[PDB]
């Protein structure tokens, strides 16, 4: 029963935390697994996303080898402070932490051949520069870059343990706005003046779901634009009715745009939704100005030509505008 | 391979943990290098911007002159904690930190001659001077100021290591609503009450992209103003139509002004 005790005691004794495994030898290859517990949020305004995961590192160390114990030794987490571990870090993180309830969420497992499994529960806010020109019809690529701080490729290498099955849990992730179309794993070397450093990259391809915008942005805009055309069928002499309808359609269009601005993220540059909203705004504006032309031309100096042509042109031109928009932005 | 441990221990022993390099001699030429990962956010409300960088401090210290290996024996952990380092700090930062996952983002490289290179991945919430009288047509200078806290130019001096090449990664900066027109590096000596202190400064000239506001703010107002002028062509004896048009255009302008003011 105390055999494991003194076994671990001699294992830790004479252990040099300063030096990597095989300090004079070839570089030590560190395998990595990630289990995505959740992707808590994706912020377009901040251009980042939060990510909770079980991050596990595998590496073979001959100092931590034992015999006569046919069982994998899971040790108390504090032992991680006493052993050597890689200086891994996420190159594009803004803030990250290891969860600490009830104890520090960390695990060390030593295998008899010398393998070390080092697991952490990390929540990290990683940067995701986003191209939002096609918003809400956009498609983002959010990456997590894993790199070693001091050690270079002559001292370590990284690889995805299990190959393409190294990252799990991506299927169970559910986001309210995005769908994770694909995920990808890349392993490369990054050359600097200091030298070549190993790197792993975990990429996610997110497609923004558009069901919200169809019913909140596009259908209301289309319906107000259609209602603006009702004035073309109203009598030219019904100035009160036609002007009230046109100006109230303009007011309703302005309401929808303001509300969307307040509800949607800031993103201070031109997007697809802005172009569609301004197109609808210009259409209702021209519909109101059409009655200005009609009223001036007839009152000031059986259906009039202008309304008769407007009835054809405005639906027609709006159809072409929609066609061009949907082709260009899809 | 115990000899490297003994070398580190013996160079540690007898080393001035507190005294600066060459207390009786000239000041220490502490060079600075920066590799900006990315400027995060720019608050027109809080007057600040968050900046992520790899701050690198270079200096010479004859006391920490080891021997045996020429591959630049780089250290971390306990011995790396207690060797003397400059008291450099950022003057403008409201809040800052050094990243600490999976390990503390820090490194201290010792060259055989005695040179020390101190690298830190830092996130600083520096403060920026914004003259918003011309917003959204404005053009700001955002500066990060680096200064010594206790030591004057007699004890410590600062300079840019590599001239204009010291601060790399400017191209990496990719802010959505701002275009980085130019960057500049400045090195000066301020005069406080105690004496002449050194100072370095890294300035960015950000220019707002005036395409969003033209589309979604100026042109709606212009079109509503034209719609208000529409009433001058309607008949003089159409009181319902012209009054409704005028008062509803006023209502629409107030709506734009009130709701837009909630978004800026």
């Amino acid at each position, epitope marked *: 029963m105390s055999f494991v005790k003194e076994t671990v005691d001699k294992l830790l004794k004479g252990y040099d935390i300063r030096l990597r495994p095989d300090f004079g030898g070839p570089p030590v290859c560190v395998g990595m697994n990630i289990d995505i517990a959740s992707i808590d949020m994706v912020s377009e305004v901040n251009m980042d996303y939060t990510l909770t995961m079980y991050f596990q590192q595998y590496w073979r160390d001959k100092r931590l080898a034992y015999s006569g114990i046919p069982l994998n030794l899971t040790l108390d987490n504090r032992v991680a402070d006493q052993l050597w571990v890689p200086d891994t870090y996420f*190159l*594009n993180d803004k803030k990250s932490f290891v969860h600490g309830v009830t104890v520090k969420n960390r695990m060390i497992r030593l295998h008899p051949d010398g393998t070390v499994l080092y697991g952490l529960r990390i929540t990290t806010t990683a940067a995701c*520069m986003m*191209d939002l020109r096609r918003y809400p019809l956009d498609e983002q*690529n959010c*990456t997590l*870059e894993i790199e070693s701080y001091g050690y270079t490729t002559d001292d370590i290498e990284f690889y995805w343990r299990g190959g393409d099955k190294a990252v799990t849990g991506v299927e169970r992730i559910e986001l309210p706005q995005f769908s994770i179309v694909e995920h990808r794993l890349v392993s490369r*070397n*990054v*050359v*600097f*003046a200091t030298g070549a450093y190993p790197r792993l990259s975990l990429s996610f391809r997110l497609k923004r779901n558009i069901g919200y915008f169809i019913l909140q942005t596009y259908m209301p805009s289309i319906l107000i634009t259609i209602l603006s055309w009702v004035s073309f069928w109203i009598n030219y002499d019904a100035s009160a009715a036609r002007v009230a309808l046109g100006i109230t359609t303009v007011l309703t269009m302005t309401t929808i745009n303001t509300h969307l601005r307040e509800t949607l993220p800031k993103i201070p540059y031109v997007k697809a939704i802005d172009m569609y909203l301004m197109g609808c705004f210009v259409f209702v504006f021209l519909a109101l100005l059409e009655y200005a032309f009609v009223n001036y031309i007839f009152f000031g100096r059986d259906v009039n030509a202008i309304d008769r042509w407007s009835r054809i042109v405005f639906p027609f031109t709006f159809s072409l505008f929609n066609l061009v928009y949907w082709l260009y932005y899809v | 391979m115990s000899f490297v441990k003994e070398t580190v221990d013996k160079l540690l022993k007898g080393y001035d943990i507190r005294l600066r390099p060459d207390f009786g001699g000239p000041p220490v030429c502490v060079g600075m290098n920066i590799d900006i990962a990315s400027i995060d956010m720019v608050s027109e409300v809080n007057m600040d911007y968050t900046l992520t960088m790899y701050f690198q401090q270079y200096w010479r210290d004859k006391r920490l002159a080891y021997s045996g290996i020429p591959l630049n024996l780089t250290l971390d952990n306990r011995v790396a904690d207690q060797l003397w380092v400059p008291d450099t700090y950022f003057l403008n930062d409201k809040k800052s930190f050094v990243h600490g996952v999976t390990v503390k983002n820090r490194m201290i490289r010792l060259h055989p001659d005695g040179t020390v290179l101190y690298g830190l991945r830092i996130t600083t919430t520096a403060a920026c001077m914004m003259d918003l009288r011309r917003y959204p047509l404005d053009e700001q200078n955002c500066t990060l100021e680096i200064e010594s806290y206790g030591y004057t130019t007699d004890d410590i001096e600062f300079y840019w290591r590599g001239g204009d090449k010291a601060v790399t990664g*400017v*191209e*990496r*900066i*990719e802010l959505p609503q701002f*275009s*980085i*027109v*130019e*960057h500049r590096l400045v090195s000066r000596n301020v005069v406080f009450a105690t004496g002449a202190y050194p100072r370095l400064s890294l300035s960015f000239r950000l220019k707002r992209n005036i395409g969003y506001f033209i589309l979604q703010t100026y042109m709606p107002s212009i079109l509503i103003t034209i719609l208000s002028w529409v009433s001058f062509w309607i008949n003089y004896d159409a009181s319902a139509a012209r009054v409704a048009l005028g008062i509803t255009t006023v209502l629409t302008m107030t709506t734009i002004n009130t709701h837009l003011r909630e978004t800026l």
Partner: nanobody
Amino acid sequence: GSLRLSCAASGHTFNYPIMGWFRQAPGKEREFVGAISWSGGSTSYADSVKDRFTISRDNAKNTVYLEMNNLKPEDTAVYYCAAKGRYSGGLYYPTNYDYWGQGTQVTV
């Protein structure tokens, strides 16, 4: 001799914002000439050719123009346009660049 080379990218160009202009002389390895970022500002040039060359960008049509005001006989080489990822690494080194153009040939 106001020469103007052009590099046109087709595909996921946002994923590779930096475009670097390189040149490889006969026999010699590939040299670094210049670089341009996504916004088109905050450019960079090599020390040797810092003033001779200029770089311009237009993302409306997604092209990069490289302008030479004065040419020299030693400039005879194959000019290459390369792309680089955001967190790829340092500018001056060729291995960090993923996608290479076939590169035009310039002789003077």
